[PDB]
């Protein structure tokens, strides 16, 4: 289980976040995907942040 | 709830919710129970007197349950829509 977990946070400014896994050795760059925010009820860009 | 040594059904399942202290001082009053009082006016106090709700009861709704025939003046009580309608039909008054 080398592949650590992270949370994609909503750029909408809501609390909402998705959580997921990524391999931090092979992929140093941050994960940015366009995911559905269900509070805004729109598809927003979600940027990787630390799970904590 | 001993199942051999298997983790019993209660211990398996997660706990939930919390108790409301405000729920213990609320009450529900049938339409049928509005006739049980005296004077044709329904306060909390009146209800208590008539032994319908109980002494530690700060709040009380009137629910559409049973039926009301005599006209009644419900005062300082919550009433549901249906209940209210019933009261109106009966010839009653409602006030906050």
């Amino acid at each position: 289980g080398i592949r650590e977990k992270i949370k994609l946070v909503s750029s909408a400014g809501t609390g909402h976040f998705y959580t997921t896994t990524k391999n931090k050795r092979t992929k140093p760059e941050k994960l940015e995907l366009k995911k559905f925010d269900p509070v805004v009820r729109q598809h927003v860009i979600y940027k990787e942040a630390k799970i904590k | 709830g001993f199942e051999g040594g298997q983790m019993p059904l209660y211990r398996r399942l997660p706990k939930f919710g919390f108790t409301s202290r405000k729920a213990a001082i609320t009450a529900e009053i049938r339409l049928s129970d509005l006739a049980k009082v005296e004077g044709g006016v329904v306060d909390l106090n009146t209800l208590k007197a008539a032994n319908i709700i109980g002494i530690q009861i700060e709040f009380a709704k009137v629910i559409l349950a049973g039926e009301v025939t005599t006209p009644v003046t419900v005062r300082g009580l919550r009433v549901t829509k249906g209940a209210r309608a019933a009261i109106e039909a009966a010839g009653g008054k409602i006030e906050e």
């Binding site: 959580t19 997921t20 | 209660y10 399942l13 997660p14 706990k15 939930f16 919710g17």
Partner: protein, 64 residues
Amino acid sequence: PKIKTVRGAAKRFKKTGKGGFKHKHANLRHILTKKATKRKRHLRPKAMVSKGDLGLVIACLPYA
């Protein structure tokens, strides 16, 4: 003496209109990111207690 309730049982179960018992599902507490969302969603709502273990629950909770 009065029967004592199993307090844990009380915490975990609530009696319903037809004498059933609702309860929160297991598996939706931690170790979530790996669980598929659909499964999680399914888990969320309260669930009735099954016919098999009903009796045990009843025993636990005499005052309901």
